[PDB]
């Protein structure tokens, strides 16, 4: 039930998720997402096998005050680790219903406050990066917020490059994380929208 910033109207479509903004599902979603991103890289020599050591030692019974088999065991120094990390995945598929329920619930979570849909990007005028600051100031972005821009038109994205103000998300490749992370979501391009 929402306005467009330039040109047309619409966005009175899109029934938002019920109840409005359930944060549990949100948490589930993002957690899944970071978990998807998580890259297992494990530098561990677990086994007494991994590290380099010859394996027969010295006398068993009869040396006294001793008791050992080998130098590669985890009770030794320099040896293997008992239960260290190995190269795993931890990537799964969260059920798709929730995969699409989430981002909707995010956009919904942007209805307690500011969000925006745009058309007519010609106010950018190539890139120049300056006219993006302008466009923002005229469209109400102090740049004291954090902003995510979702649009096509490479000319239009590439106007925005900076840490302070904004971040860019092409071709409606949107992330529940990315939009929930930033303060303002500029939904911009009305393609995936409406």
């Amino acid at each position: 039930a929402q306005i467009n910033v330039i040109g047309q109207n619409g966005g009175r479509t899109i029934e938002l998720p019920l109840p409005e903004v359930n944060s549990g599902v949100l948490h589930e979603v993002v957690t899944w997402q970071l978990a998807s991103r998580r890259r297992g890289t494990a530098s561990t020599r677990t086994r007494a096998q991994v590290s380099k050591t010859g394996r027969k030692m010295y006398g068993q019974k009869g040396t006294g005050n001793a008791r050992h088999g080998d130098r590669s065991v985890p009770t030794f120094v320099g040896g293997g680790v008992a239960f260290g990390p190995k190269p795993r995945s931890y990537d799964y598929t969260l059920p798709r219903q929730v995969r699409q329920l989430g981002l909707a619930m995010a956009i919904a979570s942007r209805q307690e406050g500011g969000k925006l849909v745009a058309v007519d990007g010609f106010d950018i005028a190539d890139a120049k990066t300056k006219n993006f600051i302008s466009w923002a100031k005229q469209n109400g972005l102090d740049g004291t917020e954090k902003v995510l821009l979702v649009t096509d038109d490479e000319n239009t994205r590439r106007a925005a490059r900076n840490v302070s103000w904004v971040s860019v998300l092409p071709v409606a490749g949107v992330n529940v994380y990315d939009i929930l992370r930033h303060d303002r979501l500029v939904i911009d391009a009305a393609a995936l929208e409406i």
Binding site: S23, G24, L26, H27, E28, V30, Y177, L180, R181
Partner: protein, 94 residues
């Protein structure tokens, strides 16, 4: 906001650490610590000594299509040879 984002409220508990616990020394005192041999089944206890043969086959099996299902609801769309897949018999194979 991710930082104001809450938990599941009771999805998971924390795991189980047997390190510490001030007087945990785990499992069973003798006998059945350390082994990977536990193994609940096996021919030893009262499975063999039990007297059957018969023989295995399991031939043709059919989709069970409830009458109650067919009647009552829908249209009587005259099910026949194709539409039926959308009617939830879904098998193939049989």
């Amino acid at each position: 906001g991710s930082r104001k984002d809450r938990k599941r409220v009771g999805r998971g508990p924390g795991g189980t650490d047997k390190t510490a616990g001030r007087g945990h020394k785990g499992q069973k005192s003798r006998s059945g610590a350390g082994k990977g041999a536990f193994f609940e089944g096996g021919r030893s206890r009262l499975i063999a000594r039990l007297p059957k043969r018969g023989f295995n086959n399991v031939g043709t099996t059919y989709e069970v299509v409830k009458l109650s299902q067919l009647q009552d609801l829908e249209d009587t769309t005259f099910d026949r040879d194709t539409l039926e897949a959308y009617r939830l018999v879904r098998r193939k194979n049989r």
